Design a protein around this ligand. Structure first.
Ligand SMILES: OC[C@H]1O[C@@H](O[C@H]2[C@H](O)[C@@H](O)[C@H](O[C@H]3[C@H](O)[C@@H](O)[C@H](O[C@H]4[C@H](O)[C@@H](O)[C@H](O)O[C@@H]4CO)O[C@@H]3CO)O[C@@H]2CO)[C@H](O)[C@@H](O)[C@@H]1O
Ligand SMILES: OC[C@H]1O[C@@H](O[C@H]2[C@H](O)[C@@H](O)[C@H](O[C@H]3[C@H](O)[C@@H](O)[C@@H](O)O[C@@H]3CO)O[C@@H]2CO)[C@H](O)[C@@H](O)[C@@H]1O
Length: 213
């Protein structure tokens, strides 16, 4: 996959869609975590957004590799695609608007929910906004922020559970509080560091270009 896309920001604490078995041909699904941010060994645990006990892991958060490059995670709806084709795939995003224009972020798709056909990437960052499901309410009694768009200032990250705080701060620290920047994207082999966090590598990962910074 490649093309143009539209971004948003989110963190709903839910079990990500690609954390289920059978969604794609992968080494293993994305890890889910308990409410205390500990990895679950069972990949079939019901989502904490659906009455269950499996939540998004805190290490599936974005970080700066250097001033021009970040790694992270996204929910994706890729035109022409399906969970079979995107789950656990990585994409090099080159931002084309906002304060981050010209910077690169490599994201692994771990979930979905955007409009079909849209090439929408919902970029994961704690404090980006819980949206329609506040799973964060059931996990730990909720995060600060507007339901959509989340927190407004970096000092609000001081209220976050510790494992989520670095990813909260990244939004203000590398991402320059960019508001829904546009991008172009290219599907790439996943950086080892990203697979280390999610646990999930596609069987077809090597068929894509190596990412070059
Ligand atoms: O089939 C296995 C199992 O499935 C259970 O249902 C799952 C779905 O399989 C799964 O796709 C769904 O995933 C959610 C995810 O948890 C949410 O975080 C995500 O939310 C997205 C939102 O859609 C978008 O606006 C943006 O994309 O990011 C956000 C956060 O605001 O949406 C996806 C897709 O809906 O979760 C379900 C569980 O709740 C069944 O319940 C189970 O019986 C089956 O065995
Ligand atoms: O559904 C995807 C995602 O949405 C996230 O919220 C979005 C809102 O949908 C979006 O309307 C808002 O955009 C506003 C922008 O931030 C403002 O600055 C203003 O100028 O215009 C826009 C009004 O349309 O952006 C937010 C953040 O990306 C949720 O946070 C998330 O949970 C959900 O998954």
């Amino acid at each position: 996959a490649s093309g143009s896309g539209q971004s948003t920001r989110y963190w709903d604490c839910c079990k990500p869609s690609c954390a289920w078995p059978g969604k794609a041909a992968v080494s293993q699904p994305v890890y889910a975590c308990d409410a205390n941010f500990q990895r679950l060994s069972d990949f079939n645990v019901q989502s904490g957004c659906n009455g269950g006990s499996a939540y998004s892991c805190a290490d599936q958060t974005p970080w700066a590799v250097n001033d021009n490059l970040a790694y992270g995670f996204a929910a994706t709806s890729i035109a022409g695609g399906s969970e079979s084709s995107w789950c656990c795939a990585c994409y090099a995003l080159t931002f084309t608007s906002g304060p981050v224009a010209g910077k690169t972020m490599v994201v692994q798709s771990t979930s979905t929910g955007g409009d079909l056909g849209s090439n929408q990437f919902d970029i994961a960052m704690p404090g980006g906004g819980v949206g329609i499901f506040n799973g964060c309410s059931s996990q730990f009694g909720g995060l600060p922020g507007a339901q959509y768009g989340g927190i407004s200032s970096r000092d609000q990250c001081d209220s976050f559970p510790a494992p989520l705080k670095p990813g909260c701060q990244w939004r203000f620290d590398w991402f320059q509080n960019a508001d829904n920047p546009t991008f172009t994207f290219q599907q790439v082999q996943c950086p080892a560091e990203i697979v280390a966090r999610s646990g999930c590598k596609r069987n077809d990962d090597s068929s894509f270009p190596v990412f070059t910074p």
